[PDB]
Write an enzyme that holds these catalytic residues in place. Structure first.
Site, PDB file in Angstrom:
ATOM      1  N   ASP A 133       4.593 -19.922  11.485  1.00  0.00           N
ATOM      2  CA  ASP A 133       3.297 -19.749  12.121  1.00  0.00           C
ATOM      3  C   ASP A 133       2.268 -20.633  11.459  1.00  0.00           C
ATOM      4  O   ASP A 133       1.137 -20.215  11.196  1.00  0.00           O
ATOM      5  CB  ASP A 133       2.876 -18.258  12.099  1.00  0.00           C
ATOM      6  N   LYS A 135      -0.620 -23.208  11.313  1.00  0.00           N
ATOM      7  CA  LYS A 135      -1.778 -23.478  12.151  1.00  0.00           C
ATOM      8  C   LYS A 135      -3.038 -23.556  11.285  1.00  0.00           C
ATOM      9  O   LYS A 135      -3.027 -23.109  10.137  1.00  0.00           O
ATOM     10  CB  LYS A 135      -1.968 -22.370  13.205  1.00  0.00           C
ATOM     11  N   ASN A 138      -4.308 -20.658   9.186  1.00  0.00           N
ATOM     12  CA  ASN A 138      -3.490 -20.263   8.039  1.00  0.00           C
ATOM     13  C   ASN A 138      -3.459 -21.321   6.947  1.00  0.00           C
ATOM     14  O   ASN A 138      -2.754 -21.148   5.955  1.00  0.00           O
ATOM     15  CB  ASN A 138      -2.026 -19.975   8.476  1.00  0.00           C
ATOM     16  N   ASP A 151      -0.132 -16.618   4.835  1.00  0.00           N
ATOM     17  CA  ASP A 151       0.460 -15.899   5.983  1.00  0.00           C
ATOM     18  C   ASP A 151       1.984 -16.055   6.050  1.00  0.00           C
ATOM     19  O   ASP A 151       2.527 -16.691   6.940  1.00  0.00           O
ATOM     20  CB  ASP A 151      -0.212 -16.287   7.292  1.00  0.00           C
ATOM     21  N   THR A 163       1.852 -18.432  17.089  1.00  0.00           N
ATOM     22  CA  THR A 163       0.699 -18.740  17.893  1.00  0.00           C
ATOM     23  C   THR A 163       1.047 -19.769  18.962  1.00  0.00           C
ATOM     24  O   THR A 163       1.561 -20.818  18.670  1.00  0.00           O
ATOM     25  CB  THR A 163      -0.376 -19.263  16.974  1.00  0.00           C
TER      26      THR A 163
HETATM   27  C1  LIG Z   1      -5.534 -11.713  10.090  1.00  0.00           C
HETATM   28  N1  LIG Z   1      -6.667 -12.385   9.430  1.00  0.00           N
HETATM   29  C2  LIG Z   1      -7.074 -11.429   8.367  1.00  0.00           C
HETATM   30  C3  LIG Z   1      -6.206 -13.690   8.849  1.00  0.00           C
HETATM   31  C4  LIG Z   1      -7.324 -14.756   8.761  1.00  0.00           C
HETATM   32  C5  LIG Z   1      -6.828 -16.140   8.337  1.00  0.00           C
HETATM   33  C6  LIG Z   1      -5.479 -16.078   7.663  1.00  0.00           C
HETATM   34  N2  LIG Z   1      -5.389 -15.414   6.352  1.00  0.00           N
HETATM   35  C7  LIG Z   1      -6.242 -15.660   5.292  1.00  0.00           C
HETATM   36  C8  LIG Z   1      -5.848 -14.963   4.191  1.00  0.00           C
HETATM   37  C9  LIG Z   1      -4.627 -14.385   4.537  1.00  0.00           C
HETATM   38  C10 LIG Z   1      -3.702 -13.569   3.803  1.00  0.00           C
HETATM   39  C11 LIG Z   1      -2.529 -13.096   4.442  1.00  0.00           C
HETATM   40  C12 LIG Z   1      -2.300 -13.456   5.773  1.00  0.00           C
HETATM   41  C13 LIG Z   1      -3.212 -14.242   6.513  1.00  0.00           C
HETATM   42  C14 LIG Z   1      -4.388 -14.699   5.884  1.00  0.00           C
HETATM   43  C15 LIG Z   1      -6.521 -15.113   2.923  1.00  0.00           C
HETATM   44  C16 LIG Z   1      -7.915 -15.177   2.593  1.00  0.00           C
HETATM   45  C17 LIG Z   1      -7.945 -15.504   1.206  1.00  0.00           C
HETATM   46  O1  LIG Z   1      -8.976 -15.710   0.547  1.00  0.00           O
HETATM   47  N3  LIG Z   1      -6.741 -15.602   0.681  1.00  0.00           N
HETATM   48  C18 LIG Z   1      -5.847 -15.392   1.688  1.00  0.00           C
HETATM   49  O2  LIG Z   1      -4.615 -15.444   1.491  1.00  0.00           O
HETATM   50  C19 LIG Z   1      -9.001 -15.040   3.518  1.00  0.00           C
HETATM   51  C20 LIG Z   1      -8.917 -14.264   4.633  1.00  0.00           C
HETATM   52  N4  LIG Z   1     -10.034 -14.393   5.378  1.00  0.00           N
HETATM   53  C21 LIG Z   1     -10.869 -15.241   4.773  1.00  0.00           C
HETATM   54  C22 LIG Z   1     -12.150 -15.686   5.158  1.00  0.00           C
HETATM   55  C23 LIG Z   1     -12.833 -16.579   4.331  1.00  0.00           C
HETATM   56  C24 LIG Z   1     -12.235 -17.021   3.139  1.00  0.00           C
HETATM   57  C25 LIG Z   1     -10.965 -16.590   2.740  1.00  0.00           C
HETATM   58  C26 LIG Z   1     -10.271 -15.666   3.584  1.00  0.00           C
HETATM   59  C27 LIG Z   1     -10.185 -13.700   6.688  1.00  0.00           C
HETATM   60  C28 LIG Z   1      -9.536 -14.623   7.731  1.00  0.00           C
HETATM   61  O3  LIG Z   1      -8.143 -14.227   7.707  1.00  0.00           O
END
Ligand SMILES: CN(C)C[C@@H]1CCn2cc(c3ccccc32)C2=C(C(=O)NC2=O)c2cn(c3ccccc23)CCO1
Length: 277
Positions: A133, A135, A138, A151, A163
């Site tokens: 996945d 993209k 991620n 992710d 996606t």
């Molecule tokens: C499903 N959704 C939560 C995934 C999406 C964007 C994808 N995403 C970010 C994300 C993770 C973790 C596990 C799966 C998917 C993730 C992470 C973080 C992070 O700081 N470390 C991460 O590993 C963040 C998640 N978010 C952040 C916004 C701004 C800065 C950093 C962000 C929310 C956006 O997350």
């Protein structure tokens, strides 16, 4: 190992984002003042929706990675109700944010970020792990604007379709994923950096999938020619003919592509990223 951490060890702050099965919350560890992105999942929900394999895979895969271009899993813990994964806080957020902000990347920026993604995939595929996945959502950016891929619950370690815009034709025709599925996604991402939008676009998933299986896309005018050539060598219906795949002799020929001529591959994380506009 250090003491197992607990919720009371942190001051939780804002929600970074919400998914179907988790919430990521910024948290500051009281004993160190370190900020972590803590991903929180409710055990009962994960069990009810049969997601144990994905949560297990997320932890297991991330625990195996040790490379600058991936989010780090620092710790895990649980209370009666919830699982908590302590992750790198990638302070600049999603690559998608920058694509939306800037519009289309210039050639210098396209090359640098594509090179980091390629380097990351080389590492991952070297471990026999398929992302599945990949993209811009991620591919996160740290404080220094280097990438950090995340992710991994839906990864495959050598059922799931990612996606729609980045789905490879084999997942639609043969229902099977390989390392080269990530290389198709890479092709889509390069196209997106240059053009500002991903190559297969339509009003719904069905119509996107129909475009993918027919290789129905075009390049905009002025698409950097060597990047066009590279994308044409990645967006290939036959997964065994994509630059980078084992049947095409791997990452050497990909990294040797003329689009990357000025890239120094050995130490990208120590290089200063080019400014985005
Ligand atoms: C499903 N959704 C939560 C995934 C999406 C964007 C994808 N995403 C970010 C994300 C993770 C973790 C596990 C799966 C998917 C993730 C992470 C973080 C992070 O700081 N470390 C991460 O590993 C963040 C998640 N978010 C952040 C916004 C701004 C800065 C950093 C962000 C929310 C956006 O997350």
């Amino acid at each position: 190992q250090p003491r197992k951490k607990r919720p009371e060890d942190f001051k939780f702050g804002k929600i970074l984002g919400e998914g179907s099965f988790s919430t990521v919350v910024l948290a500051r560890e009281l004993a160190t003042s370190r900020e972590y992105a803590i991903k929180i999942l409710e055990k009962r929900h994960i069990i009810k929706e049969n997601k144990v394999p994905y949560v297990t895979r997320e932890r297991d895969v991330m625990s195996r990675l040790d490379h600058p271009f991936f989010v780090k899993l620092y710790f895990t813990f649980q209370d009666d109700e919830k699982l908590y994964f302590g992750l790198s806080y990638a302070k600049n957020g999603e690559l998608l944010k920058y694509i939306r902000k800037i519009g289309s990347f210039d050639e210098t920026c396209t090359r640098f970020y594509t090179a980091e993604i390629v380097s990351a995939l080389e590492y991952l595929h070297g471990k026999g792990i398929i992302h599945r996945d990949l993209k811009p959502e991620n591919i996160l950016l740290n404080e220094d604007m280097h990438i950090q891929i995340t992710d991994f619950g839906t990864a495959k370690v050598l059922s799931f379709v990612g996606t729609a815009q980045y789905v490879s034709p084999e997942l639609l025709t043969e229902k099977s994923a390989c390392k080269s599925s990530d290389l198709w996604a890479l092709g889509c991402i390069i196209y997106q950096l240059v053009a500002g939008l991903p190559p297969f676009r339509a009003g719904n998933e069905y119509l996107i999938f129909q475009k993918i299986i027919k290789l129905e896309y075009d390049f905009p005018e002025k698409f950097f020619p060597k990047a066009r050539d590279l994308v044409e060598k990645l967006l290939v219906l036959d997964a065994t003919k994509r630059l980078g795949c084992e049947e095409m002799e791997g990452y050497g020929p990909l990294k040797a592509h003329p689009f990357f001529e000025s890239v120094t591959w050995e130490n990208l994380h120590q290089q200063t990223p080019p400014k985005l506009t």
